[model samples]
Target: AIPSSLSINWNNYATGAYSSGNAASDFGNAGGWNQSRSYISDGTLRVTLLKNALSGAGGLISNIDVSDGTEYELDYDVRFHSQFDWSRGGAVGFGFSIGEGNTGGDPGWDGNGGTLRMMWYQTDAGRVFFQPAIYHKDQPGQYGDTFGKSYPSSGSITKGTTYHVHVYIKSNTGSNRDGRAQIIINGTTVLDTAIRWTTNDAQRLIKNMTFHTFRGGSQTYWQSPVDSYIYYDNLVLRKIRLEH
Candidate 1:
């Protein structure tokens, strides 16, 4: 049976509901936690990283709260609205517990204030891909201490095509040493890594977490602007069953 604490909701990109106060300003004046250079168009969401925008810093969007001991599931449909470009190589599939404001790091970016992030991108050869990573306190970059895996896209993603992206993370208790994050694409498993830091009792005290996006790349060098975006729906959070 599904636990009562578990709840699901739809974040209609068109309506802009359930957003926090610290939203980005690139999306036609829309404000709040769901910040991005993207917006809803004809019932679909659009995200773009402009040429002049900060690399690995333009696509910061979406934010959701997560409890430390709960299990959370996130799934979305995404497609490359245009051809892949080398300038903008990093795009987040999803992120959790990302603190507000900028931190310092790599690929022309800074630190993420205690955030856990997972993303995907294409290789220079133009194949679609995915990466599982994390950003925690005391780290100077995103994916500072993460175990990641890569896979090839089933086919070339067309400018208007949409693909399914799924993510799951289970909070761990003292009894289990496998508290970590998982990612799925087109219903297939791609990444399953135990969070190295969560094993320590002190680090487990972090219970508050949120979700968002990080765009790291140049847009102008890519292709004609058809609008790159990611849509998330059917977000579910629950409590995991513990073994006796």
Candidate 2:
């Protein structure tokens, strides 16, 4: 069911019905050599990063670092809009940073591994072109290939198509070791498991949602062939646990 009873929320890229903020004012962009690396075009959040960087850090991160209590639910639609290849471990998607800010480590670059992210993953698998993954909070500089076997068990992921992603998260208290999260993609419940969220439970709580993208492991493999872009729309984030 659709969650959120609060009458206030913000939208990025001028996509949602809420009228008050925009990508420049509401969302904080952290990447690219030039300020024009990320922008809103026709209501879609577009990010174009170089393989390496002359200015930006070869990735894009839009973060809202407000404390939304412990448990939270999020639903959003997204698409890989331009020059997509099914391998080399290139990916883009959404999730939340588990602590102060959204990025796990540094604020302005990739390899900030402390985020609990759930997003669509494109790979070079012989049979699968794209798949969904949950990059969990393990350690610093541990984003790419840092989690479990994220390949889907029942479905496939496609490029350029609008796909809905739903997430539910509950925070753990000090020494409790009992945080939980659920991942639902296109109406399929893929992940429902316990997560030991943080070592500093009282100080380190989920601060905000993270909309981001980058290369698989690091920023050295920003292929120099085609310009790639990712898009997000209709995002609704609020405080409430969703029933599975």
Candidate 3:
């Protein structure tokens, strides 16, 4: 219920800070303000990608100096404001990544490594759905297996609107047992699936978390939408106990 070891307090600004090239803006401390170095803002933790690329993941990462397997929770408020687009070429997608490599350190073809992700995708009715996934990969440059988000729900995702996404994931008994990961959108459970794979790595803890919101392509027709940007705020990560 507090800013535990993994919380990132990114609100309450009477003075404008976190500006481009501003040293005050960083994750767990500018540890690695990955991607663009100019990601800054005082009111909201923001990141802007000027153009789109076929394979690129933009975000920041920090080490909390601790690791709490999978028995934890990730709470945050995120929004994709600025210019956005819905296309068939992986344009306008969401990526909230935690762990050592953030779901797929890469955002395209090689975009499936050891990790978990709660993203977005469209459905038949043109409504957005939760794309929560527990991804897996082999040591040999291949995305081995993934156990979530093979389907999309009726949940809707609208641009320029802020959404609250909560997640609780528990590590499996040893990557072979039934690991549980659940996603909640606006206080509604969207995807709850069994995570299977090698999730026992010390690096895959709550110490480091990465975030990304951008467009992708199949090496074809796709570029960044005009005035595109993503904003993040109120990030809270902590350990939880399930008991009656």
CA deviation > 4 Å runs, candidate 1: 1-36, 55-57, 82-87, 98-116, 135-142, 145-148, 153-159, 173-176, 199-202, 205-210, 217-244
Q: Write the per-residue lDDT of candidate 3 for residues 1-244, one digit (tens) a residue.
A: 1123355645454434354234223233334344352343666767554454433442233223334344667777777663455432232222223343534334212322244455454544566544654454232333313233432343456677877877776654434546566777677776676654344444333333434444443333444445356677777766663211
> lDDT values of the candidates?
0.45, 0.52, 0.47
The residue ranges of model 2 lying beyond 4 angstroms of the native Cα positions read 1-21, 27-35, 51-56, 100-114, 119-124, 127-151, 154-156, 219-224, 241-244
Q: Runs in model 3 with CA error above 4 Å?
A: 1-4, 12-26, 29-31, 34-42, 54-66, 88-113, 122-127, 137-152, 199-207, 225-227, 241-244
Clashing pairs in 2: 32-55, 32-56, 33-55, 33-56, 51-222, 87-123, 113-142
Better of 1 and 2 by TM-score: 2
Which run of 10 residues does model 1 get worst, by summed lDDT?
Answer: 22-31
Q: Global CA lDDT of candidate 2, please?
A: 0.52
Ranking by lDDT: 2, 3, 1
Worst 10-residue stretch by lDDT in candidate 3? 88-97
RMSD of 1: 6.9
Tens digits of per-residue lDDT for model 2, 84-181: 55345554656665654434324312222234565444444543333434333443343322234353553455568777778777776654547776
In terms of TM-score, the best-performing candidate is 2
Model 3 TM-score relative to the real fold: 0.67
lDDT of 3 at 52: 48
